[model samples]
Target: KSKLKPFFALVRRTNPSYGKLAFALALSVVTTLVSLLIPLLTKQLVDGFSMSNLSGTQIGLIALVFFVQAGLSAYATYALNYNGQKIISGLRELLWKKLIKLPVSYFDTNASGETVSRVTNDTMVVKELITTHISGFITGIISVIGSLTILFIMNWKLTLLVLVVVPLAALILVPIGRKMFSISRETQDETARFTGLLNQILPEIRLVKASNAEDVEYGRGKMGISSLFKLGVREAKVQSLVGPLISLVLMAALVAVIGYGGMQVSSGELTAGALVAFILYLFQIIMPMGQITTFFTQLQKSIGATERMIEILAEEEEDTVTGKQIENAHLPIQLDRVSFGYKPDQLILKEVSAVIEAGKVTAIVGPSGGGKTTLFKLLERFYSPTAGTIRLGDEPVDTYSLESWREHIGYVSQESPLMSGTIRENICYGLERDVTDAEIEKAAEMAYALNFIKELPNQFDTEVGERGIMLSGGQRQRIAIARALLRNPSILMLDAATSSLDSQSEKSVQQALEVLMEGRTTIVIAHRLSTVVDADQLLFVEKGEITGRGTHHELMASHGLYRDFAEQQLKMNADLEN
Candidate 1:
């Protein structure tokens, strides 16, 4: 019961039309009532046992009832299915909107592929239960109740005899139902795991090939599929037991009812027509008992799916709109005694303080794992400082709305990520307003991307493929720079922006970077000495602490590590001295 709370909460949030739901329920009742009249009409026709007495009107009336029942049942099913589609679509939209707004921390702990399955596969389970099981369960109940009541009115003793078989069947089925529930939950979990594994691997196919890990991944996938198969077989085993057991129970009841009815007919206590009507009513009660069991099993599956979806929707989203907007983003970004860690026990940035002045280049040069990139994450508001505050001008950065704050910032990293789309779309991905072709061309020209883009047949219209695979490393970087240029951000963040490029590509991107960084408050994380040599300010960070801070000459004169780093880099590139 506790597990169903999330399910009900999600359904209610979807605001499904109760009017449609009620209409469908009413139809099921009407359909069942129409079906209930069938056996009695049959008894009338059978008891009158004469060709002359079985008039054409009698046959025509029976045919009309059958047609009406069939038509109403078809419409009822269509209505239920329509409601099911509406509810699932609404739920899916809500989930998607929530998922997009969830904080980065939520994604840190959850698998992307598994999350995908919850939205796609789990929501499907809810739809299946609504479309197939809900109406069946409702009508099944009405059919059983209506048929049994009529049977009792016809003959009480024989009805009692048939009722005894129900509890006997329940004794075997109740435990099996419990077993099916647990198995179904496990199967759902395994299916999610399999989806996660697929998402994890397929995107990194190149890495797998390079690392020769195809066999390893294949083994893992095979294990996932095997587990799913085994659970499927386990579920099949329970179903095997259920179908046959229900059939055996139906057969046993049929024999008992027949033997006793035979005796009653012999003694003239019951008419042959009445006995035949009783048998038809008996089938109506027994058939829906099987459907009722199916409803419970399917309900169990939907419950499992609902619980997983609710877990995702319950996560706190990044409040992009709740805070105040920044009026003057041209102010200095000041970090005061900032301390942070991905986890509580380990502090990656410890009591770090810095002043990044507006309209100046500030470079953060550090060893790997020295929390340099972490600082950029903080500036981007991806994560908050655990023990200190970051400020724009004098106010804490958190005081500003995330959307407004992020709008002023542009980020470019070594891996310039691009979604699968045309080059034009990639450039204007997040902009809410329209962009002119001339503006795109100007940004691309400044980023040194116009030449390569114009060289292609489709130019900006050409597909970039997944993650911009169709473009070269430098081409991707130049496109990213062009994107940032178009954003025209007040603050720019470059995390090893040119570290992975070749000498020629680096030169072009560097020239583009200079143009994009012209008047912005630029913060750069770089390893190459050439990249940060001319920065207005340089912070040499080591082991999560800034050990040197000054201009190039100032650091060279006073800081030991900075001096050694510069001299070593200079040795590798002797021309740097010129």
Candidate 2:
């Protein structure tokens, strides 16, 4: 019973518009009441015609009943659809809003494809169970009760005959319905796995071609499909059982009633007119009974889907109104005793404290997987530190509105982030205010993207394709820098790219980046130690703690890991130049 609350809350959550609900339900009742009078009219008309005692006016009354019930039932169905669509639309809107505002960390545990399944597949099943099926459910109740009374009055023996099917239908309906709930959960989960893999692949497929790793992605996708196939077979087997098994019981009962009723009529134990009416009543009861069974089955199938949706819905959300704007970009950033871990068992940053001066370049030098990326994540507020505080200009970053704080900073990573949209849209996406064509062109010129933009056939309007796959690596990076330049950020973050371009192209990008970094408070994650010799200060981090912080020459004199790394990279580059 406790498990059923979420399904019922689908209606409770949408209760603000109960008038729409009331109107639909009212129409359903009226239609059912008028419809119930139908079997009675048939019985009266058949019984009268048998004796030739019925008048023309009485026949007209029966015909009029048919017309009235037909018109009301039509209107009732439309009303249900209208209200059904409205409530589902509301539910979808709320679900979408929740997903969009969810914390960045939420996706870390759940796949984007799982999110996709909830927003698409799960909601669709919920739409069927809660809306379209509700109409059948309400009408079934009224019809089943009314037809049962009529059957009993006409011929109690046959009434008992049809009634025997109820528990028989239940014998199949209840447990199979329960089994279906578990099976449904597995089916949708597998679909989510397939979708998740597909989404993850397409976003990173460029790597498979460039790095020649098609086999790995293919292996992963193959596993998802195989799992789905195995689950599909399980679902198909049981799904074949639930519906047909109930129908079979009811059909057998109908045959039994037909055989006995015919014999009773032949013996004169029942009048022909009365027996015909009893059969009509019997069928009416069966129709609604079948409908009710189907509604329950439909609901049981949706249990997995609704449970998934409800689990997501009950998760804690960020206070959208909590973050405030940080207007100043040149503010000194400070971390006090900051510590963090992606998992509870391991610590990535341990008692780490650092200060980044306003309007100065700070280079972070470290080995691969030495918590450098995790530090950046902490700075971005993608995940807050497990302990201590991060402050921007004496105020904790948490105190600032997340959107507003992020607004004052610009981030440029190696991968060249771009959406499947036009160049103009991607560049202008974060700009909250209006800007002229000249400003856009100026930013492009500064980033050296203007030449490439002109080279593209559509200029700025050209589609970048997904993740800017349409452009070369250098062009994509240049476009990303131009996007940052448009924001005119106070703090600029440069994630060192693993440069694959030849010297001339690399020099061109480096020069544009130099221009972009000037006069802004910059944080650079130094991939190769050679690029940051001129940086104001360099911090050498090893394991989860900073080992040293000083100028390049100072670190070199100390003969620490930073100096060793700088010498190693310099030798590699010199060998490459040869």
Candidate 3:
């Protein structure tokens, strides 16, 4: 029962239309009441037993009762379905809002495809419960009670005989329903896992083919399908038992009721009319009993869906708003005893400290996996430090609103990714204000992207394809820089690309970076000798600590490892130039 609270809480938070729900339920009751009339009408017609006695009025009343019942049932179904659509829409909207605001850590730990499944597939399960089962469950109860009450009045002995079969059917169904519930939960989870695999594979098809790993993916996908098939088989086994078992119980009861009623009629202990009415009422009870069973099974499945959705809905979101706003980001930035780890036990950056002077280039030169990128992540506030403080001018970074602090930092990385959209859309992706064409073109021109874009047929309107695969790596990086220029950030952070491009592309990107870095306090994760020599200060990072910090000449004189690394890189470039 405690476990069920989250499911109900999420639905209540969506604020479903209770008034419309009530109206639909009321119509269901009216329809059931109208349906109950027909059995009694049939009994009256049976008792009279004459072609001449069947007046036009009697036939007209029978037709009218059925017409009214059908009309109300259809309208009630439509109303219920409409409310279901509305509630599910609201739930998805809230889920979308929650997903976008979730902390980066949540996505870091969870698969994006599974989160997508929560927003889409899980919500659809709840919708199915509402659209297909809720009204039926309500009407089934009303119908069963109404029919049984009338049956008991007509003949208590016969009703008791029918009542014995109800408990027998329930005994068979309850445990199997529990089994179905567990199976249903597994099926949804596996479906999400399968979806995650497809999402991972489809976007990297070229890599799979390049590595000749199609057989590997095929085996994985097959295993996913096999698991789903096994769970489905389990579900089918339970369903197969339920339907046949219920039918057997009902059929046995039908035989017993008719046999006993015939004897009573022969003994003049009961009228033929009463026997006929009793049978008709028995059918009403039997039919809804099956519906009731189906409703419970579906309810179990819905609860399973709700639990997954609640896990996401209950996650703590990043506080994008509500804090002090930073007025200026151009002042010297300071990191004092900053330390962090994605896992608390293993620190990635330990007691690192640096002062980035305003409007000066500070290059961080380090070997691979030396916590340089982690330092960048800390600066970007992707994750807060495990200890110590990072300050802009005087106030801690945490003192400012996340949105305001991030607004002033421009990040450009090696192999920068672009969303699948037009070049213009990618350029203006994060800006809060409307950007004019002139501003966009100016930013592009400054980033060295405008010339290539103009030569393309669609120019700014050209689609970049997924992750900008339509363009060269250099073009994508330039667009990223153009996006940063459009934001007009006061602090620039560059994860400088390694020499992976042709000389021509490298020159173009380097020239653009110089323009974008002008007048900003710049931080570069330096991978090349050229950037290191030009930087105002060089911080040598080794094994998650800053081992040396000074100008290139100062480091060359004082630091042995920096001298060794710089000398090696310089000779390699010299050989390539020769």
Candidate 4:
């Protein structure tokens, strides 16, 4: 679909206050019409006084129309401004909802800074357009039209002279306005890129300082800022021409009107009062014409902002409503023939197949980039396989709704990400309802986190800080395991969960792992072979292919790659001893 149509459709869908919008639009039109009467009334007063035909009541009635016009103008401005605020609030709310529902993979291709710009800076531009420019444009058009109609009725010749320059001004504006639109879009994009660069650098400030690369990072950031400055200057240069060019055209029209009206009055073809009213009508028309030009310039900028926001709203979200559920009867997972990748032409997992037995620990051992982590990703359905199928019990993995599928699995990754919150929140992260304190303590005990929790001053209320920064790496991993255990999922997958721990911490974590594995099907992506010696089965993956599969002793006896890996590990241990 075209970008603009979707945005308009979104407006239609979210605009529940259409009645208020209509009333505001009607009031604006009426106010403009009332304001247009002042110039004509002034002309009538001028003619009446010059001809000695004015009555006191006539003047009083004209004064009353002026007072009523002021009141209507105030009412219309308030109505339009108030309704504009409502529209902005509605649009912002819808944008946030759509953003949160977007897929996780969207972040891989789009920067957070760019997304922030769309939600904040671009939306503000749209708000300004609606609240100010859009309303002003409508009122300007009405005033221009009404003033011209009255002018032609009063003196067609002078009105024709004043309008002669309008077409010339429009011809000049069209090309410049188009150029301004292109520059505005480019400027917004470049500004977002600059912001994204700054965001990346600022987060790694400590690393940059530790590596003594501050000067290099500074230069890169400066380059981005310089590019942003150039784009800003270009946009300003294009916009600056709009006001002056419109003013020049209006000045020429003024000269023409004055010269033509003077000739008519001197020839006895028009009275002085009538000529003066015609001149005032001409100024009224020209004023709105200038405002209309400025409004169009701002309108073009708003279109660019709307286009960016629509791009984000167009991303596909995971379908949570449809798809068959995996039956509970079958307790194991089986992969028939799976192939997948984060990007096309870069396969991370080939057509590999395996079956994990129910109620047994299956250890996956592999060299780096051998698709070990990718295997867990597939089982979790984060990325659908490009070929063949993976089944949880009798039902295909893809057949289950994403939420339903995830609810059945507990995942503990190598990084062990924990949000900045208290220990209690981290432990109960995935549970749908409020968990009892007993349940929390039981899960913590199983993961060996309760021991550390007791040592902390606040116990369960201790803050973990951002990404669990306040805790040691081993402590964070245990907290993640506790969270997984609390969920009580049938299938538990751990990816290098103990790789960051010291030997002492690893021993405690191993005890927790044993507790977590009890009476459940577990898959561990093993980085150290020693950790998986007692696993029921070992699958050794090498270069996206499973090179060996059997018990640890069986693989060491029969598989050359497994034997070589074990020998190399032994040599490393021997060297450390020396």
Q: Model 2: clashing residue pairs?
A: 323-401, 324-400, 324-401
In the range 60-177, model 4's lDDT, one tens digit per residue, is: 6766676776787677667767877777677788778888878756776676767776676666766777777877889898888777878888876877886777888989898887
The root-mean-square deviation over C-alpha atoms between each candidate and the true structure, in angstroms, is: 3.9, 5.0, 3.8, 4.4
> Over 4 Å off in model 3, which ranges?
1-4, 42-69, 155-172, 245-280, 497-501, 576-578
Ranking by TM-score: 3, 1, 4, 2
**lDDT of residue 546 for candidate 2:** 81
By the TM-score metric, which is better: model 2 or model 4? 4
lDDT of 2 by residue, 495-562 (tens): 76425444565566667667766778888887776567788888787887987888888877895666
Clashing pairs in 1: none
Model 4: residues with Cα > 4 Å off, grouped in runs: 1-7, 37-82, 157-167, 251-276, 457-461, 571-578
Better of 1 and 2 by lDDT: 1
Cα displacement (Å) at residue 400, model 4: 1.7
TM-score of 1: 0.88
User: Per-residue lDDT for 463-578 in model 3, tens only?
Assistant: 98987888887778778878877888888887775334556766776677676677888888877766558789888989889999999998889999988888888788879979
Off by over 4 Å in 2: 14-19, 42-72, 151-172, 202-280, 319-324, 327-329, 497-519, 572-578
Count: clashes, candidate 4: 0
